[PDB]
Symmetry: C2
Subunit: 188 residues, 2 copies
C-alpha cells in the first residue's frame, strides 16, 4: 500500500515550504496531492511564484483518507488556512483517526485557530511564537523540528528539508529517509 | 538601480533548485524573471510540481540585459537547456559582457554544451561530474558552492540556499545577504 499526503496550498503560502516537502515526499514514493484551497486555479505564493495545484481541496477531500496532512507557512497563507472551515473539517477528521498533521513556519497557527492538538509540544517561526501561544494551549519548543504524538512542526524555510525528511521517516521509516537524503547533498 | 535576474525554466527542471533561488533573490529585492524555455505555458518539473513562468524566454530575451542568468538543475531540464540555441545565445552574450552566470546540480553541464567559461573551476552534482569533465575543459571542485570569475556553480538541491545567497552576495553585497539569511532559520 502506497502512503498518501495532502498538501493544502493557499494564496500567500511560502513557496519554498510548499515545493520542498512535495518534492522530497515524491522522491520517497509517497503519493502527494497538492490541493488548492480556493479551487483548481493557479496559486500565487508569497514571493510570486505561481504553482498549479493537482486538484481542488473539495475534490481532494473526497479521495481521502491521507496518512499526512501538510500545512505550509507564509503569513498570509497560514491566515487563509486558519479562516477556512474546510481546513477545520479536514484537520479535525485527521486528528480523530490519529493521522499525522505536519505544519511549518507560520503554518502551525492554523492548528490553534482550529483547536487542533491542544497540550502538544510545537515549534513555529520565531516571529509566529506569540500568536501560537495565545492562551497557553501548547508548550513551545525551539527545536528545528518538533514531533509530539501526531503533531509534527518546524520553524522556517531553512528547516524545510529536515521537516520533509521527518515526514518521510514517520511514514516510510528511517532507511527510506536515509536513502532519499543522500542524493540531495545536504550538509547534515 | 535594481538588479535583474533571469531564471530559465525548462521541462524536467528540479523544482526545488528553481523556487529556492527565485524566492531568496526576491527577498533580496532583485527583480527576477522566471522565463519558460518553450513559451509562457506552465512547466512540469522533475517531481511533477507545475510552475507558471513570468514570461517566455523569447519575450524575456528582449528585456535584457540581466545581472545574473540562472540555470537550475534536474537531468532532463539541463538536457533541454543544453540543446537550446536560444540558451546558447543568451549565455554567450552574458559571458561577453562579463555578467554573472549561475548553475546548480546538473545545470552546469549546459555550460559545457554551449562552450561557456572553459578553464574555470566548477562544481556539479556528483552524478554529473563525468559529463561536465568530458574533454578536461574545466577544473573540478567538490566545494558546495564554487565561484571562479563570473561562473558560480553549486552541487545539488541541498545546496540551493547557499547557492542563492552567494548570488545575492555577488549582486547586492554581504550585508544584504546576511539580512536576508536571518529570517530563513538556516543552520549555518
Amino acid at each position: 500500500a502506497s502512503k498518501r499526503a495532502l498538501v493544502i496550498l493557499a494564496k500567500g503560502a511560502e513557496e519554498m515550504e510548499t515545493v520542498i516537502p512535495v518534492d522530497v515526499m515524491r522522491r520517497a514514493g509517497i503519493k502527494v496531492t497538492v490541493a488548492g484551497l480556493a479551487g483548481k486555479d493557479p496559486v500565487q505564493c508569497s514571493r510570486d511564484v505561481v504553482i498549479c495545484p493537482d486538484a481542488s481541496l473539495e475534490d481532494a477531500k473526497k479521495e481521502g483518507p491521507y496518512d499526512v496532512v501538510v500545512l505550509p507557512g507564509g503569513n498570509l497563507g497560514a491566515q487563509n488556512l486558519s479562516e477556512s472551515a474546510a481546513v477545520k473539517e479536514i484537520l479535525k477528521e485527521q486528528e480523530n483517526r490519529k493521522g499525522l498533521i505536519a505544519a511549518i513556519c507560520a503554518g502551525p497557527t492554523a492548528l490553534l485557530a482550529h483547536e487542533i492538538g491542544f497540550g502538544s509540544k510545537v515549534t513555529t517561526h520565531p516571529l509566529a511564537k506569540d500568536k501560537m501561544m495565545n492562551g497557553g494551549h501548547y508548550t513551545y519548543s525551539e527545536n528545528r523540528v518538533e514531533k509530539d504524538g501526531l503533531i509534527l512542526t518546524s520553524r522556517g524555510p531553512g528547516t524545510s528539508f529536515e521537516f520533509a525528511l521527518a515526514i518521510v521517516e514517520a511514514l516510510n521509516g528511517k532507511e527510506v529517509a536515509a536513502q532519499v537524503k543522500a542524493p540531495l547533498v545536504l550538509k547534515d
